[PDB]
Symmetry: D3
Subunit: 238 residues, 6 copies
């Protein structure tokens, strides 16, 4: 292994320069299967990796696990191995009532409610997506007629208090996050997730290209699509 | 007059919903004159405003002055009058060795080295440009074959120490900015300027669309304004 | 001649030995202030920086506009210092936040609340945005000599006119968390007024061996309204200049 | 079926357990549970593998957290919902002090908060401090088997690389905040780096939960593997289970 | 007027090999604490720094006041360290903020909320104001020997007596935004009490290889109605004081 | 009897006094009160020693604050509760400018807030600024007494050692925030270090109380770290005269 966590060598990538990076190891093979010659590479902790081919070019699919810290290990070590473009694919809730289950969100930049991003760039630096990646995702979305929202996502180091959830053991939310969801809503933030501030900041500050797309599956303010998009986007970025 | 600083009324805009916003009052008329039926509206402080027409639709050209604070006044008051899309056009140096004079920069988001942006959103919020505006600018730059760089800009509340200039009265740069230019360079930041962090943050946080394009007139390493102007107007056509 | 500085379009010769500048925010006010002095002459006009020279008791004086905000102020002050100015007197307009302060009153600033960003490019937040003792003394004693209604104290200096001065009559009608309830807080702490340049001016001068003073005329009382419906301070800044030459 | 969103567990599955041993790696869970009575698999979802066992007639949970504060915060919250009130983290670690040797045991009294998740529970001023009873039990368990034990402060980082001032990376760059930082923590007596304890200790200390942490030292950067890690692993594992015994 | 240090007026000889100091805030308490040990003698008194030496189980020990606050505490601790002290035990008085913590109770602090400024002169805010495990163990065991109702946990350490502890009974009657609603916040987070020296003491020791512990007697509860008289408050002091001396015995 | 928690004073003890002179060292209180008429000891508790005196027929209080912002914040608050509305601090200080000599008198217009207690009264953005009248009184008193005087910004530290970048210490090191800080302040024209002014000035300026600050230079830090006063004390008494 050329790296400490992933269990991969540069040779294993067979010249891959682009990686699709879901959170859950169990999504990896499903994504790789949309491409030619899918083969498993390795599986260590929450990092499962597969290689496939897109129009002749090798591509990697590697899970990140939950959160910025796990994500930062995967991106660093994939970068060491030669990956230069990262496409995050996820499922997500939403915090805007005009956003429906089934919609697709493309993130231009993230609110940095995490900690790992600060290990790459100070807070003043924008957790912004690469323009080429965002363009590819948006146009891939249009080509399958998906209803898409493009904008800012809030990226939280917690699932509970940082997303202002009160349905918890203590039922309390620290001062910093009390009233925060309404504030993000008013500022036009589409949704919460947990990895994108780290991903976007570490790539934008290190010369790597990153993009993120997500399918909306729930919406707290209410009572395969996204995967096709990310793979279609990947072929425009090879 | 309606708004307090600009001296403009809703009627003056004649239905305009897009404004091109340069920094220098003296560049306003020049930009308006590239379009149809240019007419001067008002001039107060650093805020000179003209109206013109692009494909039969009224557009505004209004100067911002230097810095987030005056920028924030212009954008606020224009939004009060119905403007919903803002395109900044500037002149700029560069901090990357490969970025040449004559090159055009399109800003996806800014490093927030200002103060005014914090009056709209906390620092964790990204000073990010609107996707449609940035797309329009990039496509307009392809249209005229300009050499374009797209990426992150550092937006400073000062021309001197915040851009790590030592050729100054005191020769001093405060701890926070000592070594900062090298830092931004390694992080891939293209350039310094003085308004975009405020513009982008105030717009992205209030449902307004903003983009920014700048022509490079010099390079901090190693030391076409019309080309950047041509791009901003052509991008404006696509956003009407 | 080729300008000695990048923005102002001036040479050291243009100053004729001047070491003091009166610095209004509005370019259009420059001529008016210089007119109150001897031998007023227009020097230059670039962007928001209009400059005039004049004479006071036989001494050359500069009047130069800053534009609104710390950033444009920081350029004017830096470049004037390069040209030889060592004393700066800001003359501005202001919104009062104390109920008994009348429109037209003159406020002399001892130090400012740093609600700006440019001051941080000169000194960390812990450093006081304090006025020079000589300049403040000249302003207070000038204000006394002509009998103006005058208040002396702390000013809040904001990078915005709207949310940072907790104005709600705006496009969004919203004010970010940091500034919600802020005016009442400054009011309780005895802060006199809001304006937009002094924190930068006072910080960059006090931390770089330059003298600065700050005086402003009240144009709206914020305990009553956000925007006005629609001179003493000016006589004062000129008289104070006289005492500091 | 489940009483919580991620863990795939119900209160019934815990059979009244109030104490959880929380390793990072799902692979270690079975190993830990194996040192106790009546061990059995419960569930595995994402990085959260849980087993139940019994000590002195009382049920105990072993549940992995994954890497980092964010996944740790989910496991701790959901375990608390299910009734857990005491959490013992067990890890393997490097050391940053010249005189902390491979094979030594570290018991953490509190952590430097170089993470993000802790701030979602308390402002930075609040100490990422371990519970006294837990720390006491760990230190006493360590003594009962003659380990060389260091008790003190741990630095808890959201990253493996720049937050631990590693330059052997793709960029070879460390952000200003962390340039020279390892030397600073060293001079302040910080024992080691790891990635979960600031979140664990802060969230528990500020919500009336008891937490402790023990780790075995398997490497030392300032000092310059295979069977030893396994040996060290087994030793800190022995300690965390002996400590749990005292805490039931 | 021989002194090895700038403020305390003490020399290394004065310590007679002492390596442990008991550090109350009030100079008037020093003689009282020294009187619980053997052959106490007064060493010096300058500003808020009064110091005595005594013997505990045959070994010299110093008792030296810190004054109120982290700044004067930082001077005393630094100068005692220069003189050879390696272990510091603070004995204080405190206001409890939990309803279940009664006047007369003894609090042992494991770590403190850093609502001070001096601690930042030793370590950035991320660093824990944490007590030494041996000192804390010694205090807890001593409480058991003396017999006391003891609580062990987190203390909020404030640079002020008034707004930082969210008191409105003041000249201005206001509390700055940062501290408005803060007492209820610390209460929900399990914080036992407020005092004014521990964040500085604990941080400066924990980051410099010195051992520190903190014990306090509760003289008032911010949630209760009845304010104990100054007399019954004296007995609580005496109780915590006995515990700090007994704790010292285990650390020599 | 006492109307306040720490000082051991009743309103009646002040005899209508509205101005206090506040030195750091309790032992200096008696000395300062002696320069005035009818000096009488009031109380001594912890680091708070208080005397009353008379200046041109009006009662004046002299009360020590102890070292640092926290004990200072207690004395100021409690004196305010008892009716004091003007506070003049008289201290000792280490100068950090080459051209300022031992024995010079420094008048502080405002302070760098290297403390923590000030933040309990106002956020960091608020200036730790002296009252204009008090500052004016001190500057004019210095002319009257005759002293080499400098007027400007002071750095006010919560520590004597690392916050004033002292290296004659047990650890011999200083935390990152303060490494190279003295030279930074010197370049910014800061005159001197002391330990109470940021808290005093902030708490007063933000609460409608008047405060001023004067100090005698006991060491010059560009030459020496550990030291090696009457001018400064005569000045604060003469200034009090003008503020009555």
């Amino acid at each position: 292994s050329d790296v400490f966590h992933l269990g991969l060598t540069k040779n294993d990538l067979q010249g891959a320069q682009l990686a699709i990076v879901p959170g859950d190891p169990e999504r990896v093979e499903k994504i790789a299967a949309l491409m030619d010659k899918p083969v498993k590479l390795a599986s260590h902790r929450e990092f499962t990796s597969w290689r496939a081919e897109l129009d002749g070019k090798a591509v990697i699919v590697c899970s990140t696990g939950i959160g910025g810290p796990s994500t930062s290990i995967a991106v660093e070590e994939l970068a060491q191995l030669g990956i230069r473009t990262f496409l995050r694919i996820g499922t997500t809730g939403a915090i805007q009532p005009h956003i429906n289950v089934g919609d697709v969100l493309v993130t231009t930049a993230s609110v940095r409610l995490d900690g790992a991003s600060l290990h790459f760039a100070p807070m003043e630096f924008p957790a912004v997506a690469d323009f080429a990646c965002t363009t590819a995702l948006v146009e891939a979305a249009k080509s399958i007629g998906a209803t898409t929202h493009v904008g800012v996502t809030a990226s939280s180091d917690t699932f509970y208090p940082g997303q202002e959830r009160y349905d918890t053991y203590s039922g309390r939310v620290v001062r910093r996050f009390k009233g925060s969801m309404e504030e993000w809503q008013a500022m036009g933030v589409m949704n919460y997730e947990m990895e994108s501030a780290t991903l976007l900041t570490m790539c934008a500050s290190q010369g790597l290209r990153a993009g993120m797309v997500a399918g909306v599956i729930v919406n707290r303010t209410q009572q395969s699509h996204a995967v096709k998009i990310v793979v279609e986007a990947a072929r425009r970025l090879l």
